[PDB]
Amino acid sequence: KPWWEDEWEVPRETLKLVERLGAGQFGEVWMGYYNGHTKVAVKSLKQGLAEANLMKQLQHQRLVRLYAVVTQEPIYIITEYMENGSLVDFLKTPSGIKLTINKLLDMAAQIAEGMAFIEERNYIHRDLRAANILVSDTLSCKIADFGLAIKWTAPEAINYGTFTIKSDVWSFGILLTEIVTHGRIPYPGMTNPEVIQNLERGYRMVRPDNCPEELYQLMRLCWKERPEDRPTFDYLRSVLEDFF
Amino acid sequence: PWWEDEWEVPRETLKLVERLGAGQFGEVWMGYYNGHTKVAVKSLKQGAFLAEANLMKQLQHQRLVRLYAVVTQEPIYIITEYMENGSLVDFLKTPSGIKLTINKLLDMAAQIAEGMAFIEERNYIHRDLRAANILVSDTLSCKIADFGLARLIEDPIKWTAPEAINYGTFTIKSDVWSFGILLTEIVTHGRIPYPIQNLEGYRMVRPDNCPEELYQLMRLCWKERPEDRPTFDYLRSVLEDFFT
Ligand SMILES: Cc1ccc(C(=O)Nc2cccc(C(F)(F)F)c2)cc1-c1ccc2nc(N)ncc2c1
Ligand SMILES: Cc1ccc(C(=O)Nc2cccc(C(F)(F)F)c2)cc1-c1ccc2nc(N)ncc2c1
């Protein structure tokens, strides 16, 4: 209505979905094109939005950038498209398999920086993991959420569905293992029911081979049983950035 | 009347997220209009203010912060565009700040001078001209503003002219003196002036790295007799036609 308002819409006609990147209970994720020549990522939401405003308000160097939206259902949320894809997938590429722990921790630092912002803005991610992290053109990390829906979930969240930023901290610790191992799934050779049963007895993932004991203690801080005992993301970023 | 400009919006459409400042007369916040339009919001304390909004509209110019809308219900809100780089004193400090060359540092000075030149035209008097009140766009362009919130606007010791401090006689010439002071903040990455009332007939020593030609300008700005100071129209030309 007002002349100064940002117009974030585009006609559905201007989009061409080319390759489905993922599918979930609430929709799909595609690689496509806007107006014939601008490559973009599109999240189609199964009909039968607050996400876009959220993305706009979390606009940050460390979070995926919102481009536009299609107002009529199926609702579309358009963003920048990342050639390098998700962190988990990129860590398994030749380029990624070769990254030194120094570079890997810089990426962890970037992630911590973004979560520190999310914490600043009082939001809660709820699905933090390498799979939801996008790698930019310059190999930097950008927080995202596209599972469209566990080994990454805090005990309190598993047992009582109580999610807070401290729960995100737990997930972050798990993410660190994915990072140092170049994409190994957490709890190697352990099924979800086995993970929950071991957590019932205070189990914690063993330190990965090649993971410095110092980094491992950081992880252990993230997995403290009491949510309140876990560190802040501002702390985590600080330690990771000044790690070496 | 059907033809009167529309300029109000329901308060409910605004989400104030980060306070940017506060003074005796209110606060300044970064917020969002209807979810995805980033804006700056001034909330003036209930217990006159709309006169500021009319003034801004009347002074509408490329070099002055752009008014968007207001909330007419007390507390009164004044909504404007949001400048991503904030104030110039802030930006001049950024690493990407003063990594700038006299060339750019000076184009910004000329923009400010252009702004004041218009203020001069419109017979307005700023009275609080300092780098802290200058806003920097995303494209590093500068715009004149006023948000210290310490005085009611109606159509700053180290930046105020002797006659202003002494007899409270503020004029465009007083702003000229302030500009001269503002220039020192520009060649110093926002260093505080006079690294003063009692020395004021003392004058600032040239700053380290400032062009003697850019000093002789500051001195003309700092002439004792207000009428001897140069019109902004003049400062605008010299700041632009600098390296010719
Ligand atoms: C098209 C799209 C739309 C929204 C979001 C997204 O992350 N949404 C979101 C929803 C809630 C909260 C967040 C937060 F906070 F993490 F930023 C983010 C992500 C994507 C998206 C999914 C997959 C992708 N793959 C590749 N290779 N490039 C880009 C994308 C972008
Ligand atoms: C929300 C707001 C309302 C009014 C004025 C303002 O400058 N008003 C004004 C009052 C008197 C005279 C003038 C003049 F001369 F500049 F036009 C201007 C400024 C602002 C304002 C404060 C802080 C900000 N920070 C950032 N990062 N972006 C934008 C703003 C806008």
Coordinates of C-alpha atoms and ligand atoms in Angstrom, one line a residue:
Chain A
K1 CA 0.0 0.0 0.0
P2 CA 2.5 2.7 1.1
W3 CA 4.9 4.0 -1.7
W4 CA 7.8 3.2 0.5
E5 CA 7.0 -0.4 1.2
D6 CA 9.4 -3.1 -0.1
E7 CA 7.7 -5.1 -2.8
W8 CA 8.9 -8.6 -2.3
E9 CA 6.5 -10.4 -4.7
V10 CA 6.9 -11.7 -8.2
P11 CA 4.3 -13.4 -10.4
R12 CA 4.4 -17.2 -10.3
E13 CA 4.8 -17.1 -14.1
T14 CA 8.3 -15.7 -13.8
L15 CA 9.6 -18.8 -12.2
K16 CA 10.8 -22.1 -13.8
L17 CA 11.4 -25.0 -11.4
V18 CA 14.2 -27.2 -13.0
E19 CA 15.5 -29.6 -10.4
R20 CA 14.0 -30.8 -7.1
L21 CA 16.6 -30.6 -4.4
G22 CA 14.5 -32.0 -1.6
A23 CA 11.1 -32.9 -0.4
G24 CA 9.4 -33.0 3.0
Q25 CA 6.1 -33.2 4.7
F26 CA 5.5 -29.4 4.2
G27 CA 6.7 -29.0 0.7
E28 CA 9.6 -29.1 -1.7
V29 CA 12.9 -27.3 -2.5
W30 CA 14.0 -26.6 -6.1
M31 CA 16.7 -25.1 -8.1
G32 CA 15.1 -22.9 -10.8
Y33 CA 15.2 -19.6 -12.7
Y34 CA 13.5 -16.3 -12.3
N35 CA 12.7 -14.5 -15.6
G36 CA 14.7 -16.9 -17.7
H37 CA 18.2 -16.1 -16.6
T38 CA 18.6 -15.5 -12.9
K39 CA 19.3 -18.8 -11.0
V40 CA 17.5 -19.2 -7.7
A41 CA 16.4 -21.7 -5.1
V42 CA 12.7 -22.1 -4.4
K43 CA 10.8 -23.6 -1.5
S44 CA 7.3 -24.6 -2.4
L45 CA 4.9 -24.9 0.5
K46 CA 2.2 -27.6 0.3
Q47 CA -1.1 -25.8 0.4
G48 CA -3.7 -27.5 2.6
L49 CA 4.8 -17.3 4.9
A50 CA 5.7 -16.0 8.3
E51 CA 9.0 -17.7 7.3
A52 CA 9.7 -15.1 4.7
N53 CA 9.2 -12.2 7.1
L54 CA 11.4 -14.1 9.6
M55 CA 14.1 -14.5 7.0
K56 CA 13.9 -10.8 6.2
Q57 CA 14.3 -9.9 9.9
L58 CA 17.2 -12.3 10.4
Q59 CA 19.0 -10.9 7.3
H60 CA 22.6 -11.4 8.1
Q61 CA 26.0 -12.2 6.5
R62 CA 25.8 -15.7 8.1
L63 CA 22.2 -16.6 7.1
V64 CA 20.7 -17.4 3.7
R65 CA 19.5 -14.4 1.8
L66 CA 15.7 -14.0 1.0
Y67 CA 15.0 -12.7 -2.5
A68 CA 11.3 -12.8 -3.0
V69 CA 8.0 -14.7 -2.5
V70 CA 4.9 -15.7 -4.5
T71 CA 1.8 -14.8 -2.5
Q72 CA -0.8 -17.3 -3.8
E73 CA -0.7 -20.9 -2.7
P74 CA 1.3 -22.9 -3.3
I75 CA 3.4 -20.3 -1.5
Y76 CA 6.9 -19.9 -2.9
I77 CA 9.9 -18.5 -0.9
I78 CA 12.7 -17.5 -3.2
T79 CA 16.4 -17.2 -2.2
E80 CA 19.9 -17.1 -3.6
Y81 CA 21.1 -20.4 -5.0
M82 CA 24.3 -22.0 -3.7
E83 CA 26.3 -24.1 -6.2
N84 CA 28.2 -25.7 -3.4
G85 CA 25.0 -26.8 -1.7
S86 CA 24.9 -28.0 1.9
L87 CA 27.8 -28.3 4.2
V88 CA 27.5 -32.0 4.7
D89 CA 27.5 -32.6 0.9
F90 CA 30.4 -30.2 0.4
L91 CA 32.6 -31.7 3.1
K92 CA 32.5 -34.9 1.1
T93 CA 33.7 -33.4 -2.1
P94 CA 37.4 -33.6 -2.9
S95 CA 37.8 -29.9 -2.1
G96 CA 36.1 -30.4 1.2
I97 CA 37.8 -33.7 2.2
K98 CA 41.1 -31.8 2.1
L99 CA 40.2 -28.8 4.3
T100 CA 42.5 -28.4 7.2
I101 CA 41.2 -28.3 10.8
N102 CA 42.1 -24.6 10.7
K103 CA 39.7 -23.8 7.8
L104 CA 37.1 -26.2 9.3
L105 CA 37.1 -24.2 12.5
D106 CA 36.8 -20.9 10.7
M107 CA 33.6 -22.3 9.1
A108 CA 32.4 -23.4 12.6
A109 CA 33.2 -19.9 13.8
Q110 CA 31.0 -18.5 11.0
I111 CA 28.2 -20.7 12.0
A112 CA 28.6 -19.7 15.7
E113 CA 28.5 -16.1 14.6
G114 CA 25.2 -16.6 12.9
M115 CA 23.7 -18.5 15.8
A116 CA 24.9 -15.7 18.1
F117 CA 22.8 -13.3 16.0
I118 CA 19.8 -15.7 16.1
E119 CA 20.3 -15.7 19.9
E120 CA 20.6 -11.9 19.9
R121 CA 17.3 -11.7 18.1
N122 CA 15.7 -14.1 20.4
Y123 CA 14.9 -16.8 17.9
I124 CA 15.4 -20.5 18.1
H125 CA 16.6 -22.6 15.1
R126 CA 15.4 -26.0 16.2
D127 CA 17.1 -27.9 13.3
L128 CA 20.7 -27.0 13.4
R129 CA 23.0 -29.5 11.6
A130 CA 25.4 -29.5 8.7
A131 CA 22.6 -30.6 6.4
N132 CA 20.9 -27.2 7.0
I133 CA 24.1 -25.2 6.5
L134 CA 24.8 -23.7 3.0
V135 CA 28.2 -23.0 1.5
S136 CA 28.6 -19.8 -0.4
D137 CA 30.6 -19.1 -3.5
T138 CA 33.6 -18.2 -1.4
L139 CA 33.2 -21.2 0.9
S140 CA 31.6 -19.3 3.8
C141 CA 28.7 -20.7 5.8
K142 CA 25.2 -19.6 5.9
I143 CA 22.6 -20.8 8.3
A144 CA 19.4 -22.2 6.7
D145 CA 16.4 -24.4 7.4
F146 CA 14.9 -26.5 4.7
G147 CA 14.3 -30.0 6.1
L148 CA 10.6 -29.3 5.4
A149 CA 9.9 -31.8 8.2
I150 CA 17.3 -37.4 16.4
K151 CA 21.0 -37.5 16.6
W152 CA 21.1 -33.7 16.7
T153 CA 18.4 -33.1 19.3
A154 CA 18.9 -32.2 23.0
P155 CA 17.6 -34.7 25.6
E156 CA 15.0 -32.2 26.9
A157 CA 13.8 -31.7 23.4
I158 CA 13.5 -35.5 22.8
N159 CA 11.8 -36.1 26.2
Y160 CA 9.6 -33.1 26.6
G161 CA 9.7 -31.2 23.4
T162 CA 11.2 -28.2 25.2
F163 CA 13.2 -26.2 22.7
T164 CA 15.4 -23.1 23.5
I165 CA 18.5 -21.6 22.2
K166 CA 20.4 -23.9 24.7
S167 CA 18.9 -26.8 22.7
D168 CA 20.4 -25.2 19.6
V169 CA 23.8 -25.2 21.5
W170 CA 23.5 -29.0 22.0
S171 CA 22.9 -29.4 18.2
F172 CA 25.8 -27.1 17.6
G173 CA 28.1 -29.4 19.5
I174 CA 26.9 -32.3 17.3
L175 CA 27.5 -30.2 14.2
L176 CA 31.0 -29.7 15.3
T177 CA 31.6 -33.5 15.1
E178 CA 30.2 -33.4 11.5
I179 CA 32.6 -30.6 10.7
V180 CA 35.8 -32.1 12.2
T181 CA 35.1 -35.5 10.6
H182 CA 34.4 -34.0 7.1
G183 CA 30.8 -35.1 7.1
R184 CA 30.6 -38.3 9.2
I185 CA 27.1 -38.9 10.6
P186 CA 27.1 -38.5 14.4
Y187 CA 27.0 -41.6 16.6
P188 CA 28.7 -43.8 14.0
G189 CA 26.9 -47.2 13.6
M190 CA 24.2 -46.3 16.2
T191 CA 20.5 -46.2 15.4
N192 CA 18.2 -43.5 16.7
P193 CA 16.7 -45.9 19.3
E194 CA 20.2 -46.8 20.4
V195 CA 21.1 -43.1 20.7
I196 CA 18.1 -42.3 22.9
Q197 CA 18.8 -45.3 25.1
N198 CA 22.5 -44.4 25.5
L199 CA 21.5 -40.7 26.3
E200 CA 19.3 -42.1 29.0
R201 CA 22.5 -43.3 30.7
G202 CA 24.5 -40.1 30.2
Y203 CA 26.3 -41.3 27.0
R204 CA 28.3 -38.8 25.0
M205 CA 29.9 -39.3 21.6
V206 CA 33.5 -40.4 21.7
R207 CA 36.1 -37.9 20.6
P208 CA 36.6 -38.2 16.9
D209 CA 40.0 -39.4 15.7
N210 CA 41.9 -36.3 14.5
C211 CA 39.8 -34.1 16.8
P212 CA 42.0 -32.1 19.3
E213 CA 41.1 -32.7 22.9
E214 CA 40.5 -29.0 23.3
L215 CA 37.9 -28.9 20.6
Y216 CA 36.3 -32.0 22.2
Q217 CA 36.0 -30.3 25.6
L218 CA 34.1 -27.5 23.8
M219 CA 31.7 -30.1 22.5
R220 CA 31.3 -31.6 25.9
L221 CA 30.3 -28.2 27.2
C222 CA 27.6 -28.0 24.5
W223 CA 26.3 -31.4 25.6
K224 CA 25.9 -30.6 29.3
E225 CA 22.8 -32.3 30.7
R226 CA 21.4 -29.0 32.2
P227 CA 20.4 -26.6 29.4
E228 CA 21.5 -23.6 31.6
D229 CA 25.0 -25.0 32.0
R230 CA 25.6 -24.9 28.2
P231 CA 27.5 -22.0 26.8
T232 CA 26.2 -19.0 24.8
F233 CA 26.8 -18.8 21.1
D234 CA 28.7 -15.6 21.7
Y235 CA 31.1 -17.6 23.8
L236 CA 31.4 -20.4 21.2
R237 CA 32.2 -18.0 18.4
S238 CA 34.9 -16.3 20.6
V239 CA 36.6 -19.6 21.4
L240 CA 36.4 -20.9 17.8
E241 CA 37.7 -17.7 16.3
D242 CA 40.7 -17.5 18.7
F243 CA 41.1 -21.3 18.6
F244 CA 44.7 -21.4 17.3
Chain B
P1 CA -9.7 16.5 1.9
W2 CA -9.3 14.0 -0.9
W3 CA -6.1 15.7 -2.1
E4 CA -4.1 15.9 1.1
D5 CA -1.1 13.6 1.1
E6 CA -1.5 10.4 3.1
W7 CA 1.3 9.8 5.6
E8 CA 0.1 7.9 8.6
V9 CA 0.1 4.1 9.4
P10 CA -1.4 2.1 12.3
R11 CA 1.2 1.7 15.1
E12 CA 0.4 -2.0 14.9
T13 CA 2.1 -2.4 11.6
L14 CA 5.5 -1.6 13.2
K15 CA 7.8 -4.0 15.1
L16 CA 10.5 -2.2 17.0
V17 CA 13.5 -4.5 17.2
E18 CA 16.7 -2.7 18.2
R19 CA 17.0 0.6 20.0
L20 CA 19.7 2.7 18.4
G21 CA 19.6 5.6 20.8
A22 CA 17.8 7.5 23.4
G23 CA 17.7 11.1 24.7
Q24 CA 15.6 13.3 26.8
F25 CA 13.0 13.6 24.1
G26 CA 12.6 9.9 23.1
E27 CA 14.3 7.0 21.4
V28 CA 15.4 5.8 18.0
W29 CA 14.7 2.2 16.9
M30 CA 15.4 -0.1 14.0
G31 CA 12.2 -1.9 13.1
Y32 CA 10.0 -3.4 10.4
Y33 CA 6.9 -2.3 8.8
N34 CA 4.4 -5.0 8.0
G35 CA 7.0 -7.7 8.6
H36 CA 9.5 -7.2 5.7
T37 CA 10.2 -3.5 5.3
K38 CA 13.1 -2.3 7.4
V39 CA 12.8 1.2 8.8
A40 CA 14.1 3.5 11.4
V41 CA 11.6 4.7 14.0
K42 CA 11.7 7.7 16.3
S43 CA 9.4 7.5 19.3
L44 CA 8.9 10.8 21.1
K45 CA 7.8 10.6 24.8
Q46 CA 4.2 11.5 25.6
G47 CA 4.0 14.2 28.3
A48 CA 4.9 19.8 18.4
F49 CA 6.8 16.6 17.7
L50 CA 4.8 16.3 14.4
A51 CA 6.4 19.6 13.4
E52 CA 9.6 17.6 12.9
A53 CA 7.8 15.4 10.3
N54 CA 6.5 18.4 8.4
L55 CA 9.9 20.0 8.5
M56 CA 11.5 16.8 7.1
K57 CA 8.9 16.7 4.3
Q58 CA 9.5 20.3 3.5
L59 CA 13.3 19.7 3.4
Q60 CA 12.9 16.6 1.3
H61 CA 16.2 16.2 -0.7
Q62 CA 18.6 13.5 -1.9
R63 CA 21.1 14.6 0.8
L64 CA 18.6 14.5 3.7
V65 CA 17.3 11.4 5.4
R66 CA 14.0 10.5 3.7
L67 CA 10.7 10.6 5.7
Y68 CA 8.4 7.7 5.2
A69 CA 5.5 8.1 7.6
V70 CA 4.3 8.8 11.1
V71 CA 2.0 7.5 13.8
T72 CA -0.2 10.4 15.0
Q73 CA -1.3 8.7 18.2
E74 CA 0.8 9.5 21.2
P75 CA 3.6 8.4 21.6
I76 CA 4.3 10.0 18.2
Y77 CA 6.4 7.9 15.8
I78 CA 8.5 9.3 12.9
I79 CA 9.4 6.6 10.4
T80 CA 12.2 6.8 7.9
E81 CA 14.3 4.8 5.5
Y82 CA 17.0 2.7 7.2
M83 CA 20.6 3.4 6.4
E84 CA 22.5 0.1 6.8
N85 CA 25.8 1.8 7.6
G86 CA 24.4 4.0 10.3
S87 CA 26.2 7.2 11.3
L88 CA 29.4 8.5 9.8
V89 CA 31.3 8.5 13.0
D90 CA 30.4 4.8 13.4
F91 CA 31.2 4.0 9.7
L92 CA 34.4 6.0 9.7
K93 CA 35.6 3.6 12.4
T94 CA 34.7 0.4 10.5
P95 CA 37.7 -1.4 9.0
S96 CA 36.2 -0.7 5.7
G97 CA 36.1 2.8 7.1
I98 CA 38.9 5.3 6.6
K99 CA 40.4 2.4 4.5
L100 CA 38.9 5.2 2.4
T101 CA 41.0 7.9 0.6
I102 CA 40.8 11.6 0.9
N103 CA 39.1 11.3 -2.5
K104 CA 36.2 9.4 -1.1
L105 CA 36.4 11.0 2.4
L106 CA 36.0 14.3 0.5
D107 CA 33.1 13.3 -1.8
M108 CA 31.2 12.6 1.4
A109 CA 32.1 16.0 2.8
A110 CA 30.8 17.5 -0.4
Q111 CA 27.5 15.6 -0.1
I112 CA 27.0 16.9 3.4
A113 CA 27.9 20.4 2.1
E114 CA 25.3 19.9 -0.6
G115 CA 22.7 19.0 2.0
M116 CA 23.4 22.0 4.1
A117 CA 23.4 24.2 1.0
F118 CA 19.7 23.2 0.6
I119 CA 19.1 23.8 4.3
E120 CA 20.6 27.2 3.7
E121 CA 18.2 27.8 0.7
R122 CA 15.2 26.9 2.8
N123 CA 16.2 29.3 5.6
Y124 CA 16.5 26.4 8.0
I125 CA 19.1 26.1 10.8
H126 CA 20.4 22.7 11.8
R127 CA 22.2 23.6 15.1
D128 CA 23.5 20.0 15.7
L129 CA 25.7 19.4 12.7
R130 CA 28.2 16.7 13.6
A131 CA 29.3 13.3 12.1
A132 CA 27.1 11.5 14.6
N133 CA 24.1 13.0 12.9
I134 CA 25.2 12.1 9.4
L135 CA 23.8 8.8 8.0
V136 CA 25.6 6.6 5.5
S137 CA 23.6 4.6 2.9
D138 CA 24.4 1.1 1.6
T139 CA 26.2 2.8 -1.3
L140 CA 28.3 4.9 1.1
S141 CA 26.4 8.1 0.2
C142 CA 25.9 10.5 3.1
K143 CA 22.7 12.2 4.3
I144 CA 21.9 14.8 6.9
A145 CA 19.8 13.9 9.9
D146 CA 19.2 15.0 13.5
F147 CA 18.6 12.4 16.2
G148 CA 20.6 13.1 19.3
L149 CA 17.2 13.6 20.9
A150 CA 18.5 16.2 23.4
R151 CA 16.5 19.2 22.1
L152 CA 13.0 19.7 20.6
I153 CA 13.3 20.4 16.9
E154 CA 11.5 23.6 15.8
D155 CA 11.8 25.4 12.5
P156 CA 26.7 20.1 21.3
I157 CA 29.7 21.9 22.9
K158 CA 32.7 21.1 20.7
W159 CA 30.7 21.6 17.5
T160 CA 29.0 24.8 18.5
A161 CA 30.1 28.3 17.5
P162 CA 31.3 30.8 20.1
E163 CA 28.4 33.2 19.6
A164 CA 26.0 30.2 19.9
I165 CA 27.5 29.1 23.1
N166 CA 27.7 32.6 24.4
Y167 CA 24.5 34.3 23.3
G168 CA 22.5 31.3 21.9
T169 CA 22.4 32.9 18.5
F170 CA 22.3 30.1 16.1
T171 CA 22.2 30.8 12.4
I172 CA 23.3 29.2 9.2
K173 CA 26.7 30.7 10.0
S174 CA 26.8 28.7 13.2
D175 CA 26.1 25.5 11.2
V176 CA 29.0 26.6 9.0
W177 CA 31.3 26.6 12.0
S178 CA 29.9 23.2 13.0
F179 CA 30.7 21.9 9.5
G180 CA 34.3 23.0 9.8
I181 CA 34.4 20.9 13.0
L182 CA 32.6 18.0 11.2
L183 CA 35.4 18.0 8.6
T184 CA 37.9 17.2 11.2
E185 CA 35.9 14.1 12.2
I186 CA 36.1 13.1 8.5
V187 CA 39.9 13.2 8.1
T188 CA 40.3 11.5 11.5
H189 CA 38.1 8.4 11.2
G190 CA 35.8 10.2 13.5
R191 CA 38.3 11.3 16.1
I192 CA 36.7 13.5 18.8
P193 CA 37.5 17.2 18.1
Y194 CA 40.0 19.0 20.2
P195 CA 41.8 15.8 21.3
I196 CA 37.2 23.9 25.0
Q197 CA 34.9 26.7 25.8
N198 CA 37.7 28.6 27.6
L199 CA 40.2 28.2 24.8
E200 CA 37.5 29.5 22.4
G201 CA 40.7 32.6 20.6
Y202 CA 42.2 29.1 20.0
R203 CA 41.7 27.0 16.8
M204 CA 42.2 23.3 16.2
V205 CA 45.7 22.4 14.9
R206 CA 45.5 20.6 11.6
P207 CA 44.8 16.9 11.9
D208 CA 47.5 14.4 10.9
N209 CA 47.2 13.8 7.1
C210 CA 44.7 16.6 6.4
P211 CA 45.5 18.7 3.2
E212 CA 46.6 22.3 4.1
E213 CA 44.0 23.3 1.6
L214 CA 41.4 21.4 3.6
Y215 CA 42.6 23.1 6.7
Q216 CA 42.4 26.6 5.3
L217 CA 38.8 25.7 4.6
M218 CA 38.2 24.7 8.2
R219 CA 39.7 28.0 9.3
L220 CA 37.3 30.0 7.1
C221 CA 34.6 27.9 8.8
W222 CA 36.0 28.9 12.1
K223 CA 36.1 32.7 11.6
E224 CA 35.1 34.7 14.7
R225 CA 32.7 37.0 12.9
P226 CA 29.8 34.8 11.7
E227 CA 29.2 36.8 8.5
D228 CA 32.8 36.2 7.4
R229 CA 32.2 32.5 7.3
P230 CA 31.5 31.1 3.7
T231 CA 28.1 30.0 2.5
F232 CA 27.7 26.2 2.2
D233 CA 27.2 26.8 -1.6
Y234 CA 30.8 27.7 -1.6
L235 CA 32.0 24.9 0.5
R236 CA 30.2 22.5 -1.7
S237 CA 32.1 23.7 -4.8
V238 CA 35.5 23.5 -3.2
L239 CA 34.9 20.1 -1.7
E240 CA 33.8 18.7 -5.1
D241 CA 36.3 20.6 -7.4
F242 CA 39.1 19.5 -5.0
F243 CA 41.5 17.4 -7.0
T244 CA 40.8 19.2 -10.3
Ligands
LIG1 C1 14.6 -21.8 -1.2 C2 14.8 -21.7 0.4 C3 13.9 -20.9 1.1 C4 14.0 -20.8 2.5 C5 15.2 -21.4 3.2 C6 15.5 -21.3 4.6 O1 16.6 -21.5 5.1 N1 14.4 -20.8 5.4 C7 14.5 -20.5 6.7 C8 13.3 -20.6 7.6 C9 13.3 -20.4 9.0 C10 14.6 -19.9 9.5 C11 15.8 -19.8 8.7 C12 17.1 -19.3 9.3 F1 16.9 -18.8 10.5 F2 17.9 -20.4 9.5 F3 17.7 -18.5 8.5 C13 15.7 -20.1 7.4 C14 16.2 -22.1 2.4 C15 16.0 -22.3 1.0 C16 17.1 -23.0 0.3 C17 17.1 -24.5 0.4 C18 18.1 -25.3 -0.3 C19 19.1 -24.6 -1.1 N2 20.1 -25.3 -1.8 C20 21.0 -24.6 -2.5 N3 21.9 -25.3 -3.1 N4 21.0 -23.2 -2.5 C21 20.1 -22.4 -1.9 C22 19.1 -23.1 -1.1 C23 18.1 -22.3 -0.4
LIG2 C1 13.7 7.7 12.6 C2 14.3 9.1 12.3 C3 13.3 10.2 12.4 C4 13.8 11.5 12.1 C5 15.2 11.8 11.8 C6 15.7 13.1 11.5 O1 16.9 13.2 11.1 N1 14.8 14.1 11.7 C7 15.2 15.5 11.4 C8 14.8 16.5 12.4 C9 15.1 17.9 12.1 C10 15.8 18.2 10.9 C11 16.2 17.2 9.9 C12 17.0 17.5 8.6 F1 17.5 18.7 8.6 F2 18.0 16.7 8.5 F3 16.2 17.4 7.6 C13 15.9 15.8 10.2 C14 16.1 10.7 11.8 C15 15.7 9.4 12.0 C16 16.7 8.3 12.0 C17 17.6 8.1 13.1 C18 18.6 7.1 13.2 C19 18.8 6.3 11.9 N2 19.7 5.3 11.8 C20 19.8 4.6 10.7 N3 20.8 3.6 10.7 N4 19.1 4.8 9.6 C21 18.1 5.7 9.5 C22 17.9 6.6 10.7 C23 16.9 7.6 10.8

